[PDB]
């Protein structure tokens, strides 16, 4: 996980334009629609029965805000993602029993959401930088599993 200077500023510039609450609800919702087995962790969230039921689900949206909020906070620590996400890694392993493949899938959905939102501004070099970020974040969240 090594971003270049121009990649680091590209990530930061793009993220300044991101509504984190919105993008988080959208990314979590898309995860549950595109990969519906990921719904398995969210029985308590209520109606997940159709794409609209998932996307507009108020609990899905609320959870997406907290998930992407933690992601966003992590972007200030790109040289220490393992440290940054250690307690969350431990939590998702020991308490929540979330297979870390879910972090990888969410990363890829998030990349799709950024592309959808930003259009041509989400250039191949900007994508490449975000692919490093999302892989690094998923690896960090996976790192304390045991």
């Amino acid at each position: 996980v090594h971003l270049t200077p121009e990649e680091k500023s590209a990530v930061t510039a793009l993220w300044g334009k991101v509504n984190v609450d919105e993008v988080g609800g959208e990314a979590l919702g898309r995860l549950l629609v595109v990969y519906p087995w990921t719904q398995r962790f969210f029985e308590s969230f209520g109606d997940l029965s159709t794409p609209d039921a998932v996307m507009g689900n108020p609990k899905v949206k609320a959870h997406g805000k907290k998930v992407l909020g933690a992601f966003s906070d992590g972007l200030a620590h790109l040289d220490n993602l393992k440290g940054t996400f250690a307690t969350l890694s431990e939590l998702h392993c020991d308490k929540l029993h979330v297979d870390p493949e879910n972090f990888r899938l969410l990363g890829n959905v998030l990349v799709c959401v950024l592309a959808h939102h930003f259009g041509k501004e989400f250039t191949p070099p900007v994508q490449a930088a975000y692919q490093k970020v999302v892989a690094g974040v998923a690896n960090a969240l996976a790192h304390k599993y045991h």
Partner: protein, 141 residues
Amino acid sequence: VLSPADKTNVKAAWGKVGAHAGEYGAEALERMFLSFPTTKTYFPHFDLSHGSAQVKGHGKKVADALTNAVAHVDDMPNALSALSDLHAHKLRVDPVNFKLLSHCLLVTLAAHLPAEFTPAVHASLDKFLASVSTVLTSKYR
């Protein structure tokens, strides 16, 4: 696709396993939980202690499903249909984990079939386990 030669190899190798299947199923689970600890995220409700009777019971179920698939190697989509439903809709195990159990089953077979685990048989078994995995993830979305 499993070739007629694959099917020959699989049937003979599983024939040799015979009544050890149940034991080997449990061993492959134990191997999976130790080697690939993320797989334990699907079993937080299990007793994973050493010699766990729950794990042993489960290994037998896994093995019995494999024995059935071998017996119905020409029509695995139908043989494994209810099991496919169960994984897709109830268990919702990420597809990525099937390769991990498949590898652990292969390792288990290798450790118990000194004579029979030739390069060609190894290839066929790997294909067979991937084919089982394919059927079991066919209804996920």
